[PDB]
Design a protein around this nucleic acid. Structure first.
Lengths: 98, 217, 93, 107, 306, 298, 148, 82, 98, 82, 107, 93
DNA sequence: ATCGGATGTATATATCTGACACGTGCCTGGAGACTAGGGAGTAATCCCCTTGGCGGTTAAAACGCGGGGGACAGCGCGTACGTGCGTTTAAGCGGTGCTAGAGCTGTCTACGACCAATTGAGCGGCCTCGGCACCGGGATTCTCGA
DNA sequence: TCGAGAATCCCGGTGCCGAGGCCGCTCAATTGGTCGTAGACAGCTCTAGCACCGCTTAAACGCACGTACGCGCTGTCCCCCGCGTTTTAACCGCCAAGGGGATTACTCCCTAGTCTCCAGGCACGTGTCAGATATATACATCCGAT
């Protein structure tokens, strides 16, 4: 008979190993393309350092995991294990991002 | 309402050329290229009156002109280029009208505080005249032939001329006539007259009927 | 002891915008403090940038750049225009 | 020796000379751009104009000639750009703009 | 009968008002405006990165509306090639169509949503009504003068609205003969007169006269002016069009890459044109004032004169 | 700008002329008046063709058939009358309007008639049987002018109550509702509508927009039904009469007066533009009783 | 741009720039049909240019005819009377908050009263200026409740 | 070379990877695009401000020190790049 | 019969008038005594400006109403009209105050 | 003159007044003292930092400009006090 | 006259000369105090000692000689006062210190 | 281009605290950036307070006061003591 | 869902006033004019990082696919919280009075500023080699059905 | 709940390049005068703070009490986790062109610095009305009976 772990369990271990790991979790090229797309909005044909864009993606992902973290916390205060967009919105609200 | 942005009867900013600069420290007027013309706030229609021009700067390449001009006076022209303006050239006292210069006049000085007397009646206007004074001293009659239509005191600038108009209560050499009126007096007279003009026009359009006293005044 | 302020200038611009509307001293000092704060904002930012440029001189281009950094969108745009106007009016002196 | 202040030379109000002395005494750069005080003061003039204008809007919206700091708070809270500019800033006698949440109303 | 080597990835073409220029879309998402007289390309426009599947000229000819496969519609000046306006929607666009008497207005048939009529002056939009509320596939077209809008659903229902009020001025459902509906593949009109045609899923083209639908009223039984099909092969029709005058009708058999030509009054088959048996027929158009016919197949355009 | 000059002066109506219309072929000019008489005249030489009588009261309007073979006459006798223009025979007499009939017009296919009367109701009539097929309480005041669109799908109606109402023909449906409007008609392209109001003002409205596109003033019209026509055979103009004995011609686009034809002594009561030539028939009221042909070169 | 060139452009675009429609202000009025920028020429109040001394004789004349006076003071000497002969500018309502303003220009020696835009006016907007007891219904929050 | 729609280039697996790093168990779909938006909005500032630096830098390429001073001015300073 | 408004209603009007009012809502002397008590912790016998302490209390109360505000918001995301301490704690958490 | 326990000098009516100003309807008891704590903690910093200024100011009285520069350094700047 | 570094007389490791250079080049005051760079550099050395010690603790706990940024981030989020100093700071290759919530646990 | 850093002194003080340890050059750069951050922080705060004190001379008292403003509790206490000892040592000769 | 009554709130009014607009004489920062240096600007050169493309891989993403797990809706109750009314209480006005400490001026002096002469601490650059990263494989431990 | 199985931990071995150590090679640090000056300090005010004390009262605390949201539990739906498969494009490695970045060397425009003079700003008086406050009033809105 096929076995399937209970829900979250696999995701739980994923959480554990991700707090274990430290490297990026975003594919480089898509992020870079997104950055250049954003750039051409303000000015077209602008070049970048690989170090620069690595910094961009690292700092972003840091802000992003922080947002995910405190939104997780808020959802704890929301007594749910599922996340709700309003949690993120109000988190930014408390983060003065509104 | 025709409320005028002025504490006293001054050189109206509404009737200056775009190349005409003013300094309200002395309300002097100045220009940069060629000649231009500015006028006061008030305008005479009858009676005799009087004002002055004080000159604060007259280099050799600086020749102001000072006098009177009726409406139709193109404020870019040098105050006497048309037949509706009569002025004096401030290099030598020379009466300028129709762009014609006439030496039927006295001599002008660089620091002249010049008095300007003018009498229009209540095809020359009957018994109307213009008299010019240098610091009250009679420089003499300028123009006896005066055409109809309201006139106003005007100043023409050449390249960087500094002159200013001035009323009566702060005068230096005033005539002691009991009939002539300073600039301020005719100024508030015309202001009140245009107030009544607004009154009467809003009456006409707003309420049926009009009525005015025994005509003479 | 002379204590400088800008109540004169804030009142001037008040009249220039609202000759009718008055002003309270409390809100006056509020305005003064606020403009001091934002001036220090722009000063620190421009100095930081020039230090990044390692340029010991602080010019107007720095000011434009740093206010663009500071202001939310269109304000800056509007802002810079008058600023340019100013220097133009002052360069045309 | 004709005198004319740089503010008049810019036809503005904020004191270019005073602000220049201020930034000089502020120890930010060794030399300065002579037009930078003009430029910055013009920017200040602009932003001050907008904020005081909104303040007066609220004021005569409340039939108030002399503007109260509450007008200031309301103004700075209404405009998105200015609020963003002064989000983490506090205002004396400011108070809170009117704001009631949806579920707060009884049904 | 004459092709053009200078254009590649031909996907969709459209004659100008006088049949002097031809704007063809390419897989790269480029507009190639090619001229008939000089027999050369007149313009190249970087329209989209996505191929263009819908192209229409303006009446003055100075504007072209283009639809990418990225659900990106854009108006372009033919002289400059600039994107005059650009919009995006859900349910990727199936078709665009300038209003023939008001180039400011343009109707758009999306994939899953109802056709919407927008204006260029104001970026507004009017969603046209849907009879059955569950068609999810309705083709729509202006009439010859742009006074009415003909909308046909996947369920054979046909609504004639007025272009200004979107009010139902006529209605009827086409039949498969017995009792069944058929997916309205396309609605075409004549640039001259009032005869129009419908391509349907039954592989049978139905020619009507719009006046007869208008006098038929809502929910009536209007018969076609003509019924046209390949009784021999029972071939579907990827794309059909009238002649410039409106007395000859052509159908493109993409099944066997052929072209059938019937008349209007009699309806007898004028002729048949056979293309490369290996080419997949995609697009079909007729010269508006010439017996010239443009065909797009496997990215290659062919010309058929008479 | 036009240079219309007087070429032929026409007269003979014993009473006030109420309408003059060019035949669609431009062969004749039909002139109706309150004298219960209609007068057909030559459209190019001013030659009086004939007089058609039979109406019992004054005639307020007359309209040609598209084939230039029939003429509908709306008279103050509460009756219409359809006449063969070639024989002058009263082919039909339309009864059913409860009061003075003021305007009448054929459908673009000439097989149908629209009629407005003082009864403030618009009647829709057959031609071949002359039978009233519809009747609509259109306005709250006597109808001034009714007219068909380019195809006969829409009927525009004006009346003294100041309303300009577009109605569906097949159903009588009051499609749209846009100053006492004394005249109204569709544009040649059916896209616009020209309506005269009794305040010295003409208004061209967009139908698809329902808003006035252009306005035309300078003339004088405040009491009488002064007609307005589109000058198209030459330049695009708007020609109308005026209560100042003038024949006003404005530019169509710029709305500016492009000509003033003087020579009439009474109010220029009716106007007609030639369908093919640059010819304009201007008929004045009883103090003139004259119709004047004007020909320009553009 | 030259006031003559600008005036030619204005007289060319006036017929398609503005319209007249039913107005919530009052009756019929001037509405914007194409976004009008600030300070640009909106419309001439075109009409009969007369001298001031002839105003009353005309006015009383209209007073004898029951026809409303459409006159605007060009200056102390001239007036554009549009009562009998005018343009669409005779349908510009007033607002205490105008997006427009009247100015007199001199073209080739003749004076023209042109309403320009106080601000960037957008399509559909009703055009109003400062005419400078009649109750007002302009809808502005600063409305004087009365033109006078 | 005009770019577009790389925002959806952010994979939902990537988003959930970041979430698991943040210690999240159950997630809804409605988040991701929303997330993306925020992401965009977030970077919406910095790059501009960054190139603003590059603006004053009078240069065509964009450097790390730009975003360094941005995050500094954005109060989100970062280390390891000079 | 005695009348009593329904719950919140009176407090609702209180909210309305407090958003209407702008002055302080803390008694001066207690706040001042608290401030001086806090002061002697770091150094004893320190004097103050009335303006200074007015600034202290105003700025405090501002921070406090901001905290109450966004905690209200969070409780909205908590789908409750009653407040919970965890809301305040996690709000500070998002406010970086942890 | 040794002070104490002025923290409870903060009245629950005062707290609920501030809450109503913040637009709050229903409140629990557990908040107030908790609230108070936060309050304390909050001011816990500034005064010290403030007197720190006064520390370097070498003065016995504490001034507003102290807390001005504190809130500035605390990123919570205030206006209206010079 | 042999030249010894002023940090030697201070008995420290960071170059106080470079310090004072950055100070004068930093546009902070018209003239820097003598022992001020000394004091601040001493503070800097002490805090660096603290952070490096924490990092070495973490790395040796992880049985690691070479200390990767992850160790430092963990120590950062392990020192409460240092965290407070640096909670507003972001850390490259930092990740998140293991934090598990209660209701997250299974049963 | 001669670029200046502190990683050498990082290695020095490391050996002073942990002789048997290596570092990632990445981590060294991170630490150096941190050094720069704390340096600019303390310098700006000192200049600002001196401005409040209208002082143009930034001395060790300013240093200690600003550190106390910045560092918390025992961190600040130990840092103050260390700077004090070091300036005492330097002033001793 | 309405009406009646209670109550709370927006308004007009009157006057009081104390902030507040306004004007002064006097001060000094700002303007005006003049001198120097040297930061900044420009240009030619080098480098060299970047941006571009090309091919092979698969781990990763897309997508599908149950399906148990919880989001959520509802439903009972109950305890905790608004409220209005009691009670008592410090809060505020205000005005008094002392001076400790800010807050100012006048020295005088140590103290960097600064420059010049000197150089070795430090930094770019070059080997080098060993913890470290990867890998494969074996043993351990969680987990889901008994 | 005791196994099966699965993901993981750890162990040994392989190969590597960054961490590090050392080497030329300065310029920036030190040293030592030298000088004008920031402020350290003394020594005055005066005032704002600090405390005193009384008087009034709005305010605060507690009570009782209804009540209604918080909370706890149930059942449902759906839906997101987990795994399997299929597709792809990130990556990675390499190559190549140039275009910008950084550099250096001149060159000089502009600003710092100085000195002069005064005029706008500032402290300081001075009437004076915007609005604060209180009161009666008219309007809005809740709450309960119907």
């Amino acid at each position: 008979k096929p076995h399937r772990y209970r829900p979250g369990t696999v995701a739980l271990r994923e959480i554990r190993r991700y707090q274990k790991s430290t490297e990026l979790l975003i594919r480089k090229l898509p992020f870079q393309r997104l950055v250049r797309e954003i750039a051409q909005d303000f000015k077209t044909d602008l070049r970048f350092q690989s170090s620069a864009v690595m910094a961009l993606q690292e700092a972003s992902e840091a802000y992003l995991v922080a947002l995910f973290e405190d939104t997780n916390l808020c959802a704890i205060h929301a007594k749910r294990v599922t996340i709700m967009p309003k949690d993120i919105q109000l988190a930014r609200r408390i983060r003065g991002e509104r | 309402y025709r409320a005028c942005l002025y504490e006293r009867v001054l050189l109206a900013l509404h009737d200056r050329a775009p190349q005409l600069k003013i300094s309200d420290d002395r309300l002097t007027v100045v220009g940069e290229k060629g000649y231009s013309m500015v006028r006061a706030s008030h305008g005479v229609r009858k009676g005799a009156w009087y004002f002055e021009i004080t000159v604060d700067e007259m280099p050799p390449d600086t020749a102001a002109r000072l006098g009177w001009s009726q409406p139709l006076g193109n404020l870019q022209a040098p105050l006497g280029y048309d037949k509706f303006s009569y002025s004096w050239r401030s290099k030598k006292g020379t009466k300028f009208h129709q762009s014609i210069g006439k030496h039927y006049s006295s001599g002008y000085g660089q620091g002249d505080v010049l008095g300007f007397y003018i009498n229009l009646p209540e095809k020359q206007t009957p018994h109307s005249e213009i008299i010019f004074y240098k610091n009250g001293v009679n420089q003499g009659v300028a123009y006896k032939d005066i055409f109809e239509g309201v006139y106003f005191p005007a100043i023409s600038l050449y390249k960087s001329c500094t002159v200013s108009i001035n009323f009566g209560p702060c005068f230096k050499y005033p005539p002691k006539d009991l009939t002539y009126r300073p600039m301020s007096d005719m100024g508030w007279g015309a202001v009140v007259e245009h107030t009544l003009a607004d009154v009467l026009y809003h009456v006409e359009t707003e309420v049926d009927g009009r009525r005015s006293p025994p005509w003479e005044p | 002891t002379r204590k400088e302020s800008y109540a004169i200038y804030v009142y001037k611009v008040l009249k220039q915008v609202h000759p009718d509307t008055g002003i309270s001293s409390k809100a006056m000092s509020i305005m003064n403090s606020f403009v001091n704060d934002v001036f220090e904002r722009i000063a620190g930012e421009a100095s930081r940038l020039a230090h990044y440029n390692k340029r010991s001189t602080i010019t107007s281009r720095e000011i434009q750049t740093a206010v663009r950094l500071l202001l939310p969108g269109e304000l800056a745009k509007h802002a810079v225009s008058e600023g340019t106007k100013a220097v133009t009016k002052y360069t045309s002196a | 020796a004709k005198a004319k202040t740089r503010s008049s030379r810019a036809g503005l109000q904020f004191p270019v000379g005073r602000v220049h002395r201020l930034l000089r005494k502020g120890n930010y750069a060794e030399r300065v751009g002579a037009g930078a005080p003009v430029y910055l003061a013009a920017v200040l003039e602009y932003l001050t104009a907008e904020i005081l204008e909104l303040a007066g809007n609220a004021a005569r919206d409340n039939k108030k000639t002399r503007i109260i700091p509450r007008h200031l708070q309301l103004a700075v809270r209404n405009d998105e750009e200015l609020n963003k500019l002064l989000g983490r800033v506090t205002i004396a006698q400011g108070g809170v703009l009117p704001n009631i949440q949806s579920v707060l109303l009884p049904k | 009968d004459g092709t053009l080597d200078c254009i590649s990835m031909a996907l969709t073409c459209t004659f100008n008002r006088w049949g002097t220029l031809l704007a063809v879309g390419c897989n790269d998402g480029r507009i190639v405006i090619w001229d008939f007289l000089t027999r050369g390309i007149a313009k190249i426009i970087s329209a989209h990165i996505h191929p263009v599947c819908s192209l229409c000229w303006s009446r003055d000819g100075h504007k072209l509306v283009s639809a990418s496969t990225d659900n990106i519609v854009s108006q372009w000046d033919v002289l400059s090639g600039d994107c005059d306006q650009r919009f995006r929607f859900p349910s990727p666009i199936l078709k665009v169509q300038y209003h023939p008497r008001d180039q400011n207005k343009v109707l758009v048939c999306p994939m899953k949503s109802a056709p919407v009529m927008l204006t260029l002056s104001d970026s507004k939009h009017v969603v046209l009504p849907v009879d059955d509320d569950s068609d999810l596939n309705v083709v729509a077209s202006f009439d010859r003068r742009g006074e009415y809008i003909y909308t046909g659903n996947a369920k054979g229902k046909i609504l004639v609205l007025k272009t200004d009020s979107q009010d139902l001025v006529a209605s009827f459902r086409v039949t498969t003969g017995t009792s069944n509906t058929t997916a309205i593949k396309s609605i075409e009109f004549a640039r001259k007169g009032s005869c129009f045609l419908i391509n349907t899923a039954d592989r049978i083209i139905r020619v009507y006269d719009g006046r007869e639908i208008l006098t038929c009223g809502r929910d009536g039984e209007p018969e076609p002016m003509q019924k046209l099909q390949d009784l021999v092969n029972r071939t579907p029709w990827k794309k059909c069009c009238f002649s410039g005058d409106g007395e000859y009708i052509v159908a493109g058999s993409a099944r066997q890459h052929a072209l059938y030509i019937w008349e209007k009054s009699i309806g007898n088959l004028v002729k048949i044109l056979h293309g490369t048996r290996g080419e997949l027929l995609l697009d079909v158009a007729w010269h508006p004032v010439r017996p010239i016919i443009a065909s797009i197949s496997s990215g290659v355009v062919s010309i058929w004169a008479q | 700008k036009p240079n219309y000059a007087l070429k032929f002066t026409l007269a003979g109506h014993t009473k006030a002329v109420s309408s003059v219309k060019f035949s669609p072929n431009g062969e004749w000019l039909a002139s109706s008046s309150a004298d219960k008489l209609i007068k057909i005249w030559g459209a190019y030489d001013g030659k009086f063709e004939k007089t058609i009588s039979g109406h019992k009261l004054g005639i307020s309007d007359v309209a040609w058939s598209s084939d230039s073979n029939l003429l509908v006459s709306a008279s103050d006798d509460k009756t219409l009358k359809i006449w063969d223009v070639s024989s002058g025979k009263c082919l039909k007499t339309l009864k059913g309007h409860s009061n003075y009939v003021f305007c009448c017009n054929f459908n673009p296919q000439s097989n149908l008639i629209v009629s407005g009367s003082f009864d403030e109701s618009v009647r829709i009539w057959d031609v071949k049987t002359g039978k009233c097929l519809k009747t609509l309480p259109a306005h709250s005041d006597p109808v001034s002018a009714v007219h068909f669109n380019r195809d006969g799908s829409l009927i525009v109606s004006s009346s003294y109550d100041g309303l300009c109402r577009i109605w569906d023909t097949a159903s009588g449906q009051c499609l749209k509702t846009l100053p006492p409007v004394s005249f109204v008609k569709f544009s040649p392209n059916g896209k616009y509508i020209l309506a005269a109001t009794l305040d010295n003002t003409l208004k061209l409205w967009d139908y698809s927009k329902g808003k006035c596109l252009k306005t035309y003033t300078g003339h004088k019209n405040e009491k009488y039904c002064i007609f307005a026509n589109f000058s198209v055979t030459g330049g695009k103009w708007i020609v109308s009469g005026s209560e100042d004995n003038l024949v006003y011609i404005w530019n169509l686009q710029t709305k500016e007066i492009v000509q003033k034809l003087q020579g009439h002594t009474d109010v220029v009561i009716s106007t007609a533009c030639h369908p093919t030539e640059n010819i304009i028939a201007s008929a004045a009221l009883e103090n003139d009783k004259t119709i004047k042909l004007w020909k320009s070169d553009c | 741009l030259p006031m003559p060139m600008r005036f030619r452009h204005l007289k060319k675009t006036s017929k398609e720039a503005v319209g007249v429609y039913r107005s919530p202000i009052h009756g019929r009025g001037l509405f914007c049909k194409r976004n009008i920028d600030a300070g640009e020429m909106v419309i001439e109040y075109a009409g009969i240019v007369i001298r001031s001394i002839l105003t009353d004789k005309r006015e009383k004349y209209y007073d004898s005819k029951g026809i409303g006076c459409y006159m605007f003071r060009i200056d102390d000497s001239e007036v554009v009377d549009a009562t009998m002969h005018g343009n669409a500018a005779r349908f510009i309502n007033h607002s205490c908050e105008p997006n427009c303003y009247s100015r007199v220009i001199n073209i080739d020696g003749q004076k023209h009263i042109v309403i320009f835009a106080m601000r960037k006016i957008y399509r559909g907007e009703e055009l109003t200026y400062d005419y400078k007891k009649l109750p007002c219904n302009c809808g502005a929050k600063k409305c004087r409740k009365f033109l006078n | 070379k005009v770019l577009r729609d790389n925002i959806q280039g952010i994979t939902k697996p990537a988003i959930r990877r970041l979430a698991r790093r943040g210690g999240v168990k159950r997630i809804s779909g409605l988040i991701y695009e929303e997330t993306r938006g925020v992401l965009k909005v977030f970077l919406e500032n910095v790059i501009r401000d960054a190139v603003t630096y590059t603006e004053h830098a009078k240069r065509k390429t964009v450097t790390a020190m730009d975003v360094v001073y941005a995050l500094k001015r954005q109060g989100r300073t970062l280390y390891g790049f000079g």
